[PDB]
Design a protein around this ligand. Structure first.
Ligand SMILES: C[S@@+](CC[C@H](N)C(=O)[O-])C[C@H]1O[C@@H](n2cnc3c(N)ncnc32)[C@H](O)[C@@H]1O
Ligand SMILES: C[S@@+](CC[C@H](N)C(=O)[O-])C[C@H]1O[C@@H](n2cnc3c(N)ncnc32)[C@H](O)[C@@H]1O
Lengths: 291, 291
C-alpha cells in the first residue's frame, strides 16, 4: 500500500511544490472511479466557492448566472443547501442543451435554452440590472484553438456582466500544442478533488473590487510548468493513502474533500468538524446516487 | 486681465477638483493659437514620459515602438535629445502615411510604412525579440465607434507587444453618444499643455511589472465626469495668467509646460531650474519653427 502522513492537502495550484516530466501514456489510464464523478467534482468546488462568498457577505441577494450548466443535476443540491440555510439567491441557468428536470418547478431558478454570445450577454445584463451577479462558467465545446475560444468567451462574460465574483473553468493548453500567449483573470487556482485521474483542470476563483479588472499573461513556459506540477500532483500525490487522516476513507481525494467541506455552513450543530463533514459527504453522495 | 496666483498646475486628470456643464458651442471656438501646436503638444508629453522612464532606469537599451508616428517631425528632436545624452535607444516608427524626411539617414531609427493590425503586431514582436519594448501610440482614424476601435487596437498592442511601459492616446467618448462600456489600461492620466482649446484628450502613462495587466472599466457616468472636469479645466483654468510665475510667459499653458520641462535632463549645468527650462523651451520652439 502507498501510505503517508500529511498535515493538509494542496488547496491551490500555487502550493504544489514539486514537478514530474509528463508521460503521455497517462492519457490511456482510467480517468474515473466513481459514478457521476463529474457532478461530484463540480458540486464540491461550487460549494467551496459559494460558501466563501457567504463568509464575505456577498452571496445573499445575488443572482447566480451559471453558463454551461446543463444537465446540472448537482446544481439542485447547491440550490437546496443555500435555500434551506435561509440565503436569498436567484439562479439563472443558461445552456443550449437541456437541464435535468429536477430543476423545474422552482420559482427561484430560471432555466434558459441558449448558447450565449457577446450580444446575448449584453441583453441579459440589461435584463438583470440592477441585481448583483455572481458568475459560474463551465462552458466546453478540446483543441488549443477551442480552449482559447472558450477562455476568450469567459473574459467577455466578466467584462459585460461585471460580476462581484466568478468561478471559471481553467486548463492550460499543452506546451507542445502552443498557439499563442493569452490572458486569464487573476484569482486563486482552486484544485479539484475527484477530477479525472490525469486532468490538469482547476477552477479560477475571483472576487471583484471597484472598476478594476486584473489579468495575467500565460506563455508556453508557463504551460510547461502547469503540465509538470499537475502531473506530479496526479501521478504521485493523489495516489496516496493519508494514514493519519481519521476518517472512514483515507484516499487523498477524500482528505482533500474534507478540507473543502469543513468550510461549509449547516443548520444542524455538530460536536466535531469530523461529524459535520461525514454528514455533508453522506448527504452529497446520497443525493448523487453514489454508494 | 484674468490674473491668479498658483502653487503648481494640474498634472493629472485626478487632480482636477472642480467641474462645469459642458457647453457644445465651445466646439466652434479657436482650437489653436500656435503654428505646429500639435507637434509641440506631442513633444512635451513624450519628453515628460520618456524622462520618467530614464529616472527608473528603464529607457537605456530599449526599443521605442511608436505606432501612429507620421509625420513625426517632433520625434527627431526627441531622438536627438536622448542620443546626445548618451542613452542607447532604437526607434521603430510605424504608420501607413509617410514620415518627415528629417528622420531619414539615422542608423538608430527605422521608418516603417504599414498600418498595423493584430497579425502584423505578432510579426514584429517575433522580430524585436528579445529587445525590451516601450510603446507610444498616437493612432487616429472620430465617432464613438471609431474611438472604441482605436482603444481596442491599443489594448491589442499591449497584449501582443508586452511592453515595459506605454503612452496611449486617451479621450473619453461623449456621454450623449455612449455606445457601450469598455476597459482601458490602468495608468496616470497625464494632462497636456498646448492641447486644442477644448480638447478632452490626455495621455495614459503605464509601467508594467510582471505578467500582470490591470484594466479599468469606463461607463457613461464616467464619461459625464470626464466631460465636466475637462470642460472646467479648458474653460476656466487654462484661461488664467499665473502672475506669481516668474517667467517671460505667464499664460497657464507655459506654467504647466514649466513643470514638465523641469523634470528633463540636460548635459549643460544650470544655476537655476528657471535657466534650464527657459533653455529647453527656447531649444524646442527653435526646432519647431515657433516664434
Ligand atoms: C462540461 S458541460 C457542463 C456541465 C454542467 N456544468 C453540469 O453541471 O452538468 C459544458 C457545457 O457547456 C455548454 N456550452 C458550450 N458552449 C456554450 C455557450 N456558448 N453557451 C452556453 N453553454 C454552452 C455545452 O452545451 C455543455 O452543456
Ligand atoms: C494624429 S496622427 C499621428 C501624428 C504623429 N504622432 C506625429 O508625431 O506627427 C494619427 C496617425 O495614426 C495613423 N494610423 C491610423 N491607424 C493606424 C494603424 N493601424 N497603424 C499605424 N498608424 C495608423 C494615421 O495614418 C496618422 O498618421
Amino acid at each position: 500500500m502507498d501510505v503517508v502522513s500529511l498535515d493538509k492537502p494542496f488547496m491551490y495550484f500555487e502550493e504544489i511544490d514539486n514537478e514530474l516530466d509528463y508521460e503521455p501514456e497517462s492519457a490511456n489510464e482510467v480517468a474515473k472511479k466513481l459514478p457521476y464523478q463529474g457532478q461530484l467534482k463540480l458540486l464540491l468546488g461550487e460549494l467551496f466557492f459559494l460558501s466563501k462568498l457567504q463568509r464575505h457577505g456577498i452571496l445573499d441577494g445575488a443572482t447566480v448566472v451559471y453558463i454551461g450548466s446543463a444537465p446540472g443535476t448537482h446544481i439542485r443540491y447547491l440550490r437546496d443547501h443555500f435555500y434551506n440555510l435561509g440565503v436569498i439567491i436567484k439562479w439563472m441557468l443558461i445552456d443550449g442543451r437541456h437541464h435535468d428536470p429536477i430543476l423545474n418547478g422552482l420559482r427561484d431558478v430560471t432555466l434558459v435554452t441558449r448558447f450565449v454570445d457577446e450580444e446575448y450577454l449584453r441583453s441579459i445584463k440589461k435584463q438583470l440590472h440592477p441585481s448583483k451577479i455572481i458568475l459560474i462558467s463551465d462552458v466546453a465545446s478540446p483543441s488549443t484553438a477551442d480552449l482559447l475560444s472558450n477562455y476568450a468567451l469567459q473574459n467577455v462574460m466578466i467584462s459585460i456582466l461585471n460580476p462581484v465574483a466568478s468561478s471559471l473553468k481553467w486548463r492550460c493548453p499543452f506546451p507542445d500544442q502552443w498557439i499563442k500567449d493569452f490572458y486569464i483573470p487573476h484569482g486563486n487556482k482552486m484544485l479539484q478533488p475527484f477530477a479525472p485521474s490525469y486532468s490538469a483542470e482547476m477552477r479560477l476563483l475571483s472576487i471583484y473590487t471597484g472598476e478594476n479588472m486584473r489579468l495575467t499573461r500565460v506563455t508556453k513556459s508557463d504551460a510547461v510548468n502547469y503540465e509538470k506540477k499537475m502531473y506530479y500532483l496526479n501521478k504521485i500525490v493523489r495516489n496516496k493513502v493519508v494514514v493519519n487522516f481519521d476518517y472512514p476513507n483515507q484516499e487523498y481525494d477524500y482528505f482533500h474533500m474534507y478540507f473543502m467541506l469543513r468550510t461549509v455552513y449547516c443548520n444542524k450543530t455538530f460536536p466535531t468538524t469530523k461529524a459535520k463533514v461525514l454528514f455533508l459527504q453522506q448527504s452529497i453522495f446520497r443525493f448523487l446516487n453514489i454508494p
